[PDB]
Design an enzyme around this catalytic site. Structure first.
Site, PDB file in Angstrom:
ATOM      1  N   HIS A 118      38.082  30.338  32.688  1.00 19.73           N
ATOM      2  CA  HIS A 118      38.804  29.285  33.389  1.00 19.73           C
ATOM      3  C   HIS A 118      39.088  28.077  32.508  1.00 19.73           C
ATOM      4  O   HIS A 118      39.783  27.158  32.954  1.00 19.73           O
ATOM      5  CB  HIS A 118      38.016  28.831  34.623  1.00 19.73           C
ATOM      6  CG  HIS A 118      37.904  29.879  35.685  1.00 19.73           C
ATOM      7  ND1 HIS A 118      36.777  30.656  35.850  1.00 19.73           N
ATOM      8  CD2 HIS A 118      38.780  30.281  36.636  1.00 19.73           C
ATOM      9  CE1 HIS A 118      36.964  31.489  36.859  1.00 19.73           C
ATOM     10  NE2 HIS A 118      38.172  31.282  37.352  1.00 19.73           N
TER      11      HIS A 118
ATOM     12  N   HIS B 185      47.537  33.201  43.192  1.00 24.18           N
ATOM     13  CA  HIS B 185      46.601  33.322  42.079  1.00 24.18           C
ATOM     14  C   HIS B 185      45.664  34.507  42.282  1.00 24.18           C
ATOM     15  O   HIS B 185      45.511  35.356  41.396  1.00 24.18           O
ATOM     16  CB  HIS B 185      45.807  32.021  41.932  1.00 24.18           C
ATOM     17  CG  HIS B 185      44.744  32.064  40.879  1.00 24.18           C
ATOM     18  ND1 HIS B 185      44.829  31.342  39.708  1.00 24.18           N
ATOM     19  CD2 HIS B 185      43.565  32.728  40.825  1.00 24.18           C
ATOM     20  CE1 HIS B 185      43.753  31.564  38.975  1.00 24.18           C
ATOM     21  NE2 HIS B 185      42.971  32.404  39.629  1.00 24.18           N
ATOM     22  N   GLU B 186      45.024  34.581  43.451  1.00 22.73           N
ATOM     23  CA  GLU B 186      44.068  35.654  43.700  1.00 22.73           C
ATOM     24  C   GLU B 186      44.764  37.008  43.765  1.00 22.73           C
ATOM     25  O   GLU B 186      44.314  37.978  43.148  1.00 22.73           O
ATOM     26  CB  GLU B 186      43.295  35.384  44.992  1.00 22.73           C
ATOM     27  CG  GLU B 186      42.592  34.031  45.049  1.00 22.73           C
ATOM     28  CD  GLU B 186      41.600  33.814  43.919  1.00 22.73           C
ATOM     29  OE1 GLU B 186      41.327  34.766  43.158  1.00 22.73           O
ATOM     30  OE2 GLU B 186      41.089  32.681  43.793  1.00 22.73           O
TER      31      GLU B 186
ATOM     32  N   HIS C 289      45.471  38.612  40.570  1.00 25.68           N
ATOM     33  CA  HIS C 289      44.342  39.302  39.953  1.00 25.68           C
ATOM     34  C   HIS C 289      44.358  40.786  40.299  1.00 25.68           C
ATOM     35  O   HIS C 289      44.048  41.633  39.454  1.00 25.68           O
ATOM     36  CB  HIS C 289      43.017  38.672  40.392  1.00 25.68           C
ATOM     37  CG  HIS C 289      42.617  37.473  39.589  1.00 25.68           C
ATOM     38  ND1 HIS C 289      42.621  37.465  38.211  1.00 25.68           N
ATOM     39  CD2 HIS C 289      42.180  36.249  39.970  1.00 25.68           C
ATOM     40  CE1 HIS C 289      42.215  36.284  37.778  1.00 25.68           C
ATOM     41  NE2 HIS C 289      41.941  35.528  38.826  1.00 25.68           N
TER      42      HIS C 289
ATOM     43  N   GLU D  45      43.014  34.948  33.586  1.00 25.72           N
ATOM     44  CA  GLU D  45      43.097  33.732  34.387  1.00 25.72           C
ATOM     45  C   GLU D  45      44.466  33.078  34.261  1.00 25.72           C
ATOM     46  O   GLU D  45      45.050  32.650  35.264  1.00 25.72           O
ATOM     47  CB  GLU D  45      42.000  32.750  33.975  1.00 25.72           C
ATOM     48  CG  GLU D  45      40.727  32.872  34.791  1.00 25.72           C
ATOM     49  CD  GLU D  45      40.974  32.693  36.274  1.00 25.72           C
ATOM     50  OE1 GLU D  45      41.647  31.708  36.649  1.00 25.72           O
ATOM     51  OE2 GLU D  45      40.513  33.544  37.062  1.00 25.72           O
TER      52      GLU D  45
ATOM     53  N   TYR E 241      37.400  40.553  32.257  1.00 27.49           N
ATOM     54  CA  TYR E 241      37.205  39.168  32.683  1.00 27.49           C
ATOM     55  C   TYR E 241      36.120  38.493  31.838  1.00 27.49           C
ATOM     56  O   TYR E 241      35.060  38.094  32.320  1.00 27.49           O
ATOM     57  CB  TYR E 241      36.863  39.129  34.168  1.00 27.49           C
ATOM     58  CG  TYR E 241      37.178  37.816  34.849  1.00 27.49           C
ATOM     59  CD1 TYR E 241      36.163  36.973  35.285  1.00 27.49           C
ATOM     60  CD2 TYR E 241      38.493  37.422  35.065  1.00 27.49           C
ATOM     61  CE1 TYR E 241      36.448  35.774  35.914  1.00 27.49           C
ATOM     62  CE2 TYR E 241      38.787  36.224  35.692  1.00 27.49           C
ATOM     63  CZ  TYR E 241      37.762  35.405  36.114  1.00 27.49           C
ATOM     64  OH  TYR E 241      38.050  34.213  36.740  1.00 27.49           O
TER      65      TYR E 241
ATOM     66  N   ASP F  39      30.998  30.423  31.987  1.00 24.73           N
ATOM     67  CA  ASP F  39      32.259  30.824  32.603  1.00 24.73           C
ATOM     68  C   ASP F  39      32.786  32.107  31.961  1.00 24.73           C
ATOM     69  O   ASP F  39      33.968  32.231  31.634  1.00 24.73           O
ATOM     70  CB  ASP F  39      33.278  29.686  32.505  1.00 24.73           C
ATOM     71  CG  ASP F  39      34.562  29.981  33.250  1.00 24.73           C
ATOM     72  OD1 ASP F  39      34.504  30.650  34.303  1.00 24.73           O
ATOM     73  OD2 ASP F  39      35.631  29.538  32.779  1.00 24.73           O
TER      74      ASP F  39
HETATM   75 ZN   LIG Z   1      41.235  33.500  38.937  1.00 22.26          ZN
END
Ligand SMILES: [Zn+2]
Ligand SMILES: O[C@@H]1[C@@H](O)[C@H](O)OC[C@H]1O
Ligand SMILES: O[C@@H]1[C@@H](O)[C@H](O)OC[C@H]1O
Ligand SMILES: [Ca+2]
Ligand SMILES: [Ca+2]
Ligand SMILES: [Ca+2]
Ligand SMILES: [Ca+2]
Length: 316
Positions: A231, A142-143, A146, A166, A157, A226
Protein backbone atom coordinates in the site's frame (compact mmCIF):
# COMPACT_ATOMS: atom_id res chain seq x y z
CA UNK A 1 -32.85 -17.32 -4.75
CA UNK A 2 -35.54 -17.92 -7.37
CA UNK A 3 -37.95 -15.06 -7.94
CA UNK A 4 -39.08 -12.31 -10.28
CA UNK A 5 -36.71 -9.46 -11.08
CA UNK A 6 -37.85 -6.06 -9.82
CA UNK A 7 -36.50 -2.63 -8.89
CA UNK A 8 -36.26 -1.20 -5.39
CA UNK A 9 -35.27 2.26 -4.19
CA UNK A 10 -33.12 3.33 -1.27
CA UNK A 11 -30.55 5.83 -0.01
CA UNK A 12 -26.79 5.36 0.07
CA UNK A 13 -24.25 5.98 2.80
CA UNK A 14 -24.07 9.61 1.62
CA UNK A 15 -27.84 10.17 1.67
CA UNK A 16 -28.23 9.94 -2.12
CA UNK A 17 -31.26 8.16 -3.55
CA UNK A 18 -30.90 5.41 -6.14
CA UNK A 19 -32.75 2.50 -7.72
CA UNK A 20 -31.41 -1.01 -7.14
CA UNK A 21 -32.21 -4.29 -8.88
CA UNK A 22 -33.83 -6.70 -6.43
CA UNK A 23 -35.53 -10.10 -6.54
CA UNK A 24 -39.01 -10.83 -5.17
CA UNK A 25 -39.77 -14.11 -3.39
CA UNK A 26 -41.77 -13.46 -0.21
CA UNK A 27 -39.09 -10.86 0.59
CA UNK A 28 -37.24 -8.49 -1.74
CA UNK A 29 -33.60 -9.61 -1.91
CA UNK A 30 -30.54 -7.63 -2.98
CA UNK A 31 -30.11 -9.92 -5.98
CA UNK A 32 -29.50 -8.17 -9.30
CA UNK A 33 -30.26 -10.58 -12.14
CA UNK A 34 -29.64 -8.01 -14.90
CA UNK A 35 -25.82 -8.29 -14.74
CA UNK A 36 -24.18 -11.55 -15.72
CA UNK A 37 -25.08 -14.38 -13.36
CA UNK A 38 -26.15 -11.96 -10.66
CA UNK A 39 -24.88 -9.42 -8.13
CA UNK A 40 -25.64 -10.65 -4.60
CA UNK A 41 -25.34 -8.52 -1.44
CA UNK A 42 -25.33 -10.00 2.05
CA UNK A 43 -25.67 -8.89 5.68
CA UNK A 44 -22.86 -10.04 7.97
CA UNK A 45 -24.84 -8.68 10.96
CA UNK A 46 -21.77 -7.18 12.69
CA UNK A 47 -20.01 -10.57 12.74
CA UNK A 48 -17.13 -12.04 10.72
CA UNK A 49 -18.92 -15.10 9.32
CA UNK A 50 -19.15 -14.86 5.54
CA UNK A 51 -21.03 -14.33 3.33
CA UNK A 52 -23.81 -14.02 5.90
CA UNK A 53 -27.46 -13.79 4.86
CA UNK A 54 -28.60 -12.68 1.42
CA UNK A 55 -30.06 -9.26 2.17
CA UNK A 56 -33.83 -9.54 2.61
CA UNK A 57 -36.19 -6.55 2.75
CA UNK A 58 -39.93 -6.61 3.37
CA UNK A 59 -41.13 -3.80 1.07
CA UNK A 60 -38.32 -3.18 -1.48
CA UNK A 61 -37.69 0.27 0.06
CA UNK A 62 -34.20 0.65 1.50
CA UNK A 63 -34.15 4.00 3.31
CA UNK A 64 -33.04 2.81 6.75
CA UNK A 65 -29.61 3.78 8.06
CA UNK A 66 -28.89 0.06 8.40
CA UNK A 67 -29.64 -0.50 4.70
CA UNK A 68 -27.40 2.22 3.25
CA UNK A 69 -24.12 0.22 3.14
CA UNK A 70 -25.97 -2.60 1.39
CA UNK A 71 -27.56 -0.13 -1.04
CA UNK A 72 -24.15 1.21 -2.06
CA UNK A 73 -22.35 -2.15 -2.16
CA UNK A 74 -25.13 -3.47 -4.40
CA UNK A 75 -25.35 -0.38 -6.62
CA UNK A 76 -21.61 0.27 -6.99
CA UNK A 77 -20.90 -3.39 -7.77
CA UNK A 78 -23.25 -2.90 -10.71
CA UNK A 79 -21.43 0.24 -11.85
CA UNK A 80 -18.09 -1.56 -11.71
CA UNK A 81 -19.58 -4.48 -13.64
CA UNK A 82 -20.89 -2.02 -16.23
CA UNK A 83 -17.47 -0.38 -16.53
CA UNK A 84 -15.63 -3.62 -17.28
CA UNK A 85 -18.33 -4.74 -19.73
CA UNK A 86 -18.72 -1.50 -21.69
CA UNK A 87 -15.09 -0.28 -21.64
CA UNK A 88 -12.98 -3.46 -21.68
CA UNK A 89 -15.43 -6.05 -23.06
CA UNK A 90 -14.99 -8.04 -19.85
CA UNK A 91 -17.87 -9.95 -18.26
CA UNK A 92 -17.45 -9.80 -14.48
CA UNK A 93 -14.05 -10.33 -12.86
CA UNK A 94 -13.36 -13.80 -14.31
CA UNK A 95 -14.45 -12.71 -17.80
CA UNK A 96 -17.17 -15.39 -17.77
CA UNK A 97 -19.85 -13.56 -15.74
CA UNK A 98 -19.00 -14.94 -12.31
CA UNK A 99 -21.51 -13.92 -9.65
CA UNK A 100 -20.36 -10.85 -7.72
CA UNK A 101 -20.99 -11.19 -3.99
CA UNK A 102 -20.57 -8.50 -1.34
CA UNK A 103 -21.05 -8.59 2.44
CA UNK A 104 -21.57 -5.42 4.48
CA UNK A 105 -21.85 -4.72 8.21
CA UNK A 106 -18.70 -6.80 8.57
CA UNK A 107 -17.65 -6.92 12.23
CA UNK A 108 -18.03 -3.91 14.55
CA UNK A 109 -16.34 -0.61 13.72
CA UNK A 110 -14.17 -2.28 11.07
CA UNK A 111 -12.16 0.37 9.20
CA UNK A 112 -11.51 -1.54 5.98
CA UNK A 113 -12.84 -3.44 2.98
CA UNK A 114 -11.34 -6.36 1.11
CA UNK A 115 -11.69 -9.04 -1.53
CA UNK A 116 -11.18 -12.35 0.27
CA UNK A 117 -10.53 -14.56 -2.76
CA UNK A 118 -14.28 -15.08 -3.25
CA UNK A 119 -16.25 -11.90 -2.41
CA UNK A 120 -16.09 -8.28 -1.32
CA UNK A 121 -16.32 -7.43 2.37
CA UNK A 122 -17.09 -3.99 3.83
CA UNK A 123 -16.84 -2.80 7.40
CA UNK A 124 -18.96 0.06 8.72
CA UNK A 125 -15.99 2.09 9.96
CA UNK A 126 -15.81 3.35 13.54
CA UNK A 127 -17.54 6.60 12.54
CA UNK A 128 -14.29 8.53 13.08
CA UNK A 129 -11.70 7.21 10.62
CA UNK A 130 -14.32 5.78 8.24
CA UNK A 131 -18.03 5.71 7.59
CA UNK A 132 -19.28 2.53 5.85
CA UNK A 133 -16.72 1.96 3.13
CA UNK A 134 -19.09 0.68 0.43
CA UNK A 135 -20.12 4.35 0.18
CA UNK A 136 -16.96 5.03 -1.83
CA UNK A 137 -17.25 3.85 -5.43
CA UNK A 138 -13.46 3.94 -5.80
CA UNK A 139 -13.32 1.61 -2.79
CA UNK A 140 -15.81 -0.83 -4.32
CA UNK A 141 -14.14 -0.78 -7.74
CA UNK A 142 -10.76 -0.99 -5.99
CA UNK A 143 -11.75 -4.25 -4.29
CA UNK A 144 -13.53 -5.78 -7.29
CA UNK A 145 -10.47 -5.00 -9.42
CA UNK A 146 -8.47 -7.24 -7.07
CA UNK A 147 -10.70 -10.08 -8.26
CA UNK A 148 -9.86 -9.09 -11.84
CA UNK A 149 -6.14 -9.17 -11.01
CA UNK A 150 -6.40 -12.50 -9.18
CA UNK A 151 -7.98 -14.01 -12.32
CA UNK A 152 -5.47 -12.54 -14.79
CA UNK A 153 -1.96 -11.36 -13.93
CA UNK A 154 -2.22 -13.01 -10.50
CA UNK A 155 0.21 -10.55 -8.92
CA UNK A 156 1.60 -11.93 -5.66
CA UNK A 157 0.49 -9.61 -2.85
CA UNK A 158 3.99 -8.74 -1.64
CA UNK A 159 6.92 -6.52 -2.60
CA UNK A 160 6.80 -4.92 -6.06
CA UNK A 161 4.27 -7.36 -7.51
CA UNK A 162 2.02 -6.58 -4.54
CA UNK A 163 2.42 -2.84 -5.04
CA UNK A 164 1.55 -3.21 -8.73
CA UNK A 165 -1.47 -5.22 -7.58
CA UNK A 166 -2.44 -2.35 -5.27
CA UNK A 167 -1.77 0.30 -7.92
CA UNK A 168 -3.97 -1.54 -10.44
CA UNK A 169 -6.82 -1.47 -7.92
CA UNK A 170 -6.26 2.23 -7.20
CA UNK A 171 -6.06 2.97 -10.94
CA UNK A 172 -9.27 1.23 -12.01
CA UNK A 173 -11.02 2.29 -8.82
CA UNK A 174 -10.30 5.84 -9.95
CA UNK A 175 -11.27 5.22 -13.58
CA UNK A 176 -14.55 3.62 -12.47
CA UNK A 177 -15.17 6.73 -10.37
CA UNK A 178 -14.56 8.91 -13.43
CA UNK A 179 -16.77 6.53 -15.43
CA UNK A 180 -19.70 7.28 -13.10
CA UNK A 181 -18.62 10.95 -13.14
CA UNK A 182 -19.84 11.94 -9.65
CA UNK A 183 -17.21 14.26 -8.14
CA UNK A 184 -14.36 12.17 -9.59
CA UNK A 185 -10.76 12.77 -8.58
CA UNK A 186 -7.31 11.19 -8.37
CA UNK A 187 -7.70 10.57 -4.62
CA UNK A 188 -8.54 7.25 -2.95
CA UNK A 189 -11.34 6.90 -0.41
CA UNK A 190 -12.28 10.56 0.03
CA UNK A 191 -16.02 9.85 0.17
CA UNK A 192 -15.84 7.54 3.22
CA UNK A 193 -12.61 8.74 4.88
CA UNK A 194 -12.64 10.92 8.03
CA UNK A 195 -16.16 12.42 7.95
CA UNK A 196 -14.86 15.11 10.31
CA UNK A 197 -11.92 16.23 8.13
CA UNK A 198 -12.63 17.99 4.84
CA UNK A 199 -10.47 17.71 1.75
CA UNK A 200 -8.42 14.64 2.75
CA UNK A 201 -8.25 11.07 1.47
CA UNK A 202 -6.57 7.75 2.23
CA UNK A 203 -4.04 7.95 -0.62
CA UNK A 204 -3.28 10.41 -3.42
CA UNK A 205 -2.47 9.34 -6.96
CA UNK A 206 -1.72 12.91 -8.06
CA UNK A 207 0.68 13.52 -5.14
CA UNK A 208 1.43 10.33 -3.19
CA UNK A 209 3.82 12.23 -0.90
CA UNK A 210 0.85 14.23 0.46
CA UNK A 211 0.30 11.24 2.78
CA UNK A 212 3.88 9.99 3.11
CA UNK A 213 3.95 7.59 0.16
CA UNK A 214 6.86 7.37 -2.31
CA UNK A 215 6.49 9.16 -5.63
CA UNK A 216 9.83 7.93 -7.01
CA UNK A 217 11.61 4.58 -7.11
CA UNK A 218 14.49 5.96 -5.02
CA UNK A 219 12.03 6.50 -2.14
CA UNK A 220 10.58 2.98 -2.17
CA UNK A 221 9.96 1.28 1.16
CA UNK A 222 12.04 -1.88 1.61
CA UNK A 223 11.03 -3.04 5.09
CA UNK A 224 8.65 -5.88 5.87
CA UNK A 225 5.59 -3.90 7.01
CA UNK A 226 2.48 -4.04 4.83
CA UNK A 227 3.74 -7.16 3.04
CA UNK A 228 6.69 -5.03 2.01
CA UNK A 229 4.71 -1.82 1.59
CA UNK A 230 2.19 -2.95 -1.03
CA UNK A 231 0.00 0.00 0.00
CA UNK A 232 3.05 2.30 0.18
CA UNK A 233 5.07 1.66 -2.97
CA UNK A 234 1.85 1.63 -5.01
CA UNK A 235 2.36 5.39 -4.89
CA UNK A 236 5.23 4.99 -7.35
CA UNK A 237 2.98 3.29 -9.91
CA UNK A 238 -0.03 5.47 -9.06
CA UNK A 239 2.07 8.54 -9.84
CA UNK A 240 3.20 7.09 -13.17
CA UNK A 241 -0.40 6.39 -14.19
CA UNK A 242 -1.49 9.87 -13.10
CA UNK A 243 1.30 11.33 -15.24
CA UNK A 244 0.42 9.10 -18.21
CA UNK A 245 -3.18 10.33 -18.14
CA UNK A 246 -2.85 13.94 -16.96
CA UNK A 247 0.74 14.92 -17.76
CA UNK A 248 3.01 17.18 -15.78
CA UNK A 249 6.66 17.68 -14.85
CA UNK A 250 7.87 15.53 -11.96
CA UNK A 251 11.40 15.86 -10.58
CA UNK A 252 12.10 17.81 -13.75
CA UNK A 253 10.89 15.10 -16.16
CA UNK A 254 8.09 16.24 -18.46
CA UNK A 255 5.22 13.89 -19.34
CA UNK A 256 2.64 14.65 -22.03
CA UNK A 257 -0.78 13.42 -20.94
CA UNK A 258 -2.91 11.21 -23.17
CA UNK A 259 -6.13 11.05 -21.14
CA UNK A 260 -7.94 8.62 -18.88
CA UNK A 261 -9.45 6.27 -21.47
CA UNK A 262 -6.07 5.50 -23.04
CA UNK A 263 -4.49 4.93 -19.63
CA UNK A 264 -7.21 2.35 -19.00
CA UNK A 265 -6.70 0.53 -22.29
CA UNK A 266 -2.92 0.42 -21.80
CA UNK A 267 -3.06 -0.84 -18.21
CA UNK A 268 -5.96 -3.23 -18.82
CA UNK A 269 -4.02 -4.74 -21.72
CA UNK A 270 -0.85 -4.86 -19.61
CA UNK A 271 -2.80 -6.48 -16.77
CA UNK A 272 -4.51 -9.13 -18.91
CA UNK A 273 -1.91 -9.87 -21.62
CA UNK A 274 1.59 -9.30 -20.23
CA UNK A 275 1.77 -9.23 -16.43
CA UNK A 276 2.56 -12.39 -14.46
CA UNK A 277 2.38 -13.22 -10.74
CA UNK A 278 6.00 -12.18 -10.07
CA UNK A 279 6.16 -9.06 -12.26
CA UNK A 280 8.17 -6.16 -10.84
CA UNK A 281 8.07 -2.42 -11.54
CA UNK A 282 10.58 -2.66 -14.40
CA UNK A 283 8.55 -5.46 -15.99
CA UNK A 284 5.40 -3.39 -15.51
CA UNK A 285 7.14 -0.65 -17.51
CA UNK A 286 7.87 -3.09 -20.33
CA UNK A 287 4.29 -4.39 -20.18
CA UNK A 288 2.92 -0.84 -20.38
CA UNK A 289 5.22 -0.02 -23.31
CA UNK A 290 4.34 -3.19 -25.22
CA UNK A 291 0.63 -2.59 -24.58
CA UNK A 292 0.75 1.00 -25.84
CA UNK A 293 2.74 -0.23 -28.84
CA UNK A 294 0.09 -2.85 -29.63
CA UNK A 295 -2.67 -0.26 -29.26
CA UNK A 296 -1.14 2.86 -30.80
CA UNK A 297 2.16 1.95 -32.46
CA UNK A 298 5.81 2.09 -31.46
CA UNK A 299 6.19 5.65 -32.81
CA UNK A 300 3.05 6.93 -31.07
CA UNK A 301 2.74 9.74 -28.55
CA UNK A 302 1.14 7.13 -26.29
CA UNK A 303 4.23 4.91 -26.19
CA UNK A 304 6.38 8.01 -25.67
CA UNK A 305 4.28 9.20 -22.72
CA UNK A 306 4.39 5.76 -21.10
CA UNK A 307 8.18 6.01 -21.39
CA UNK A 308 8.30 9.54 -19.95
CA UNK A 309 6.03 8.71 -17.01
CA UNK A 310 8.08 5.75 -15.77
CA UNK A 311 11.28 7.77 -16.16
CA UNK A 312 9.75 10.46 -13.94
CA UNK A 313 9.19 7.98 -11.09
CA UNK A 314 12.58 6.38 -11.72
CA UNK A 315 11.46 3.01 -13.13
CA UNK A 316 13.79 1.84 -15.90
ZN1 LIG B 1 -6.26 -3.17 -2.28
O1 LIG C 1 -32.37 -1.94 13.13
C1 LIG C 1 -31.76 -2.97 12.31
C2 LIG C 1 -32.67 -3.25 11.18
O2 LIG C 1 -32.60 -2.16 10.25
C3 LIG C 1 -32.33 -4.54 10.45
O3 LIG C 1 -33.28 -4.81 9.50
O4 LIG C 1 -32.23 -5.69 11.39
C4 LIG C 1 -31.20 -5.42 12.40
C5 LIG C 1 -31.48 -4.15 13.18
O5 LIG C 1 -30.34 -3.86 14.00
O1 LIG D 1 -25.89 -1.24 16.46
C1 LIG D 1 -24.64 -1.53 17.15
C2 LIG D 1 -23.50 -1.16 16.27
O2 LIG D 1 -23.38 0.28 16.30
C3 LIG D 1 -22.16 -1.75 16.67
O3 LIG D 1 -21.33 -1.73 15.57
O4 LIG D 1 -22.22 -3.15 17.17
C4 LIG D 1 -23.28 -3.28 18.18
C5 LIG D 1 -24.62 -2.97 17.53
O5 LIG D 1 -25.69 -3.26 18.44
CA1 LIG E 1 -37.57 -1.81 3.67
CA1 LIG F 1 -14.42 11.73 -5.49
CA1 LIG G 1 -11.66 9.10 -5.55
CA1 LIG H 1 -12.44 13.15 5.27
Amino acid sequence: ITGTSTVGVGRGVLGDQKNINTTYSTYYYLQDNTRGNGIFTYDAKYRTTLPGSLWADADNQFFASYDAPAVDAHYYAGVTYDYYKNVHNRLSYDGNNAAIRSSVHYSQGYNNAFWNGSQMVYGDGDGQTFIPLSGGIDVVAHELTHAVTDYTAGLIYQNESGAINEAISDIFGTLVEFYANKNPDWEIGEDVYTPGISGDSLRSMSDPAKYGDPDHYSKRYTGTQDNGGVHINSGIINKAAYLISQGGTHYGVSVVGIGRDKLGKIFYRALTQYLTPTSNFSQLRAAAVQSATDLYGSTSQEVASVKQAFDAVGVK
